[PDB]
């Protein structure tokens, strides 16, 4: 292997200990030392048991070259990137596995403002340090200062909602023996939600599995707890809860792609005639409630980084993706799987809506396929053959990312992950649940054939 695999697009990511190790740790904290502005570095970790020691060995890179570090603990990502932003430090880095196997752990970094760092804008950089280091581990000549106080963030998340206006819904929460409980805890005594808990203490060894809502299996005991109690709706939480998946009463999993406009829609009304920016996968339905709601649609490319740019640069209120994303200007233009279900429940709470009826209209009205992945012996050739069978339609053609086709009353968007080694297929509709089982059977033929 010529260069060293864990070194991603977005992340730092990779089994432990042939690909992530306490040494390489200790290199990474030296080569990030080198990429920040001034300042110190805030670190935190999830439950993973190997976090703590890959932490650790983080620290000790990062004192020995001068910088002072901020350990804030235990956590979830969005508070390494509130704390940073929120202590104006240097940057940050979580130490998380995400939903990785449980030989796997990883990285994610940030600079000033919690601004990310990718491949392109220092990791790399960072890589090919660590790559050609050998010199001897020095001493620490900074200190570590343990800040676990949450008083801060806590009160930016309790900020969202008008908490005079909520009213006591029956909440099932299910944090997958990943970090999200702990927050939840310290948040309800100012809320007067009846928490359902599902999974909550956290727990490395994951007795119940990984946390992944998104697996069938894991979505079910979601669904389960919520009709079983009669709950308004449910929530679920990756690992490192920065993505939140949302169930309504009926244990119906909704589609990531309609809470982007529902909560930009909850956004608009506190921040009206704001800007706000989605990704090319799934657009019509975020297009329309954006402007109904009297905010301004921005297209951007997807990927957390292209998106906080965008938003940046438009001073953008709100921004979404149908991958369960969901970025927050007030929030270091940062993503949080905390602040979307407190809007919502907000949402329910004012409105007299279900989610379900919040949602209903919108699913009818843009009905999607779900995000579909390809694995194909030749990925080019397969978009050639598929572009190649509409041409005679005479679609309006999009490159923002990767090849989205207007059709009229059907649209698809056709990528490569940046992620990972695969084809993603989105398609939606105008109405019209048939064309749009018809024409991804008929793209999905394309793409293996
Ligand atoms: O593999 P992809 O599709 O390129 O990228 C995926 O991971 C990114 C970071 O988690 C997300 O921001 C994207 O929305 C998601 O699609
Ligand atoms: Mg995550």
């Known amino acids: 292997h010529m260069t060293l695999p864990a070194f991603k697009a977005y992340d730092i990511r990779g089994r432990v200990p042939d690909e992530l190790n306490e040494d390489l740790a200790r290199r990474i904290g030296v080569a990030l030392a080198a990429q920040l502005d001034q300042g110190p570095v805030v670190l935190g970790h999830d439950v993973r048991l190997a976090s703590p020691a890959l932490q650790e060995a983080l620290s000790a890179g990062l004192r020995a070259s001068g910088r002072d570090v901020i350990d804030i603990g235990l956590c979830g990502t969005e508070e390494v990137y509130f704390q940073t932003d929120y202590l104006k430090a240097a940057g940050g880095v979580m130490v998380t596995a995400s939903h990785n196997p449980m030989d796997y752990n990883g990285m994610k970094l940030v600079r000033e403002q919690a601004r990310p760092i990718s491949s392109d804008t220092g990791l790399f950089a960072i890589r090919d340090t660590v790559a050609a280091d050998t010199a001897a581990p020095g001493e620490p000549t900074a200190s570590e200062q343990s800040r676990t106080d949450k008083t801060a963030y806590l009160e930016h998340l309790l900020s969202y909602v008008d908490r005079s206006t909520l009213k006591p819904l029956k909440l099932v929460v299910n944090a997958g023996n990943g970090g999200a409980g702990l927050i939840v805890d310290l948040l ?41 109690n009669g709950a308004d709706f449910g929530i679920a939480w990756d690992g490192d809860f920065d993505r939140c998946f949302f169930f309504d009463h009926t244990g119906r999993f909704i ?194 054939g």
């Open 188 to 228: 309800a005594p100012h809320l007067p939600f009846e928490f359902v808990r599902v999974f909550h203490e956290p727990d490395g060894n994951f007795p119940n599995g990984i946390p992944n809502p998104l697996l069938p299996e894991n979505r079910d005991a979601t669904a389960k707890a919520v009709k079983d």
């Open 255 to 448: 589609e990531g792609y309609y809470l982007v406009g529902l909560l930009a829609q909850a956004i608009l009304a506190k921040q009206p005639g704001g800007k706000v920016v989605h990704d090319p996968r799934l657009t019509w339905n975020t297009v329309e409630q954006v402007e109904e709601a009297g905010g301004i649609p921005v297209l951007c490319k997807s990927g957390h980084a292209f998106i906080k740019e965008k938003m940046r640069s438009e001073n953008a209120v709100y921004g979404g993706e149908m991958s369960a994303h969901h970025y927050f200007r007030e929030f270091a233009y940062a993503d949080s799987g905390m602040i979307p279900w407190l809007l919502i429940a907000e949402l329910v709470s004012q409105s007299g809506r279900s989610l379900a009826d919040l949602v209903e209209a919108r699913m009818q009205k843009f009905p999607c396929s779900g995000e579909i992945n390809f694995k194909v012996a030749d990925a080019k050739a397969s978009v050639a053959r598929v572009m190649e069978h509409y041409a005679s339609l005479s679609p309006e053609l999009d490159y923002t990312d990767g090849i989205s086709a207007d059709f009229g009353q059907w649209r698809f968007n056709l990528r490569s992950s940046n992620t990972e080694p695969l084809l993603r297929l989105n398609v939606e509709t105008r109405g019209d649940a048939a064309l749009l089982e018809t024409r991804t059977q008929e793209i999905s033929n394309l793409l293996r």
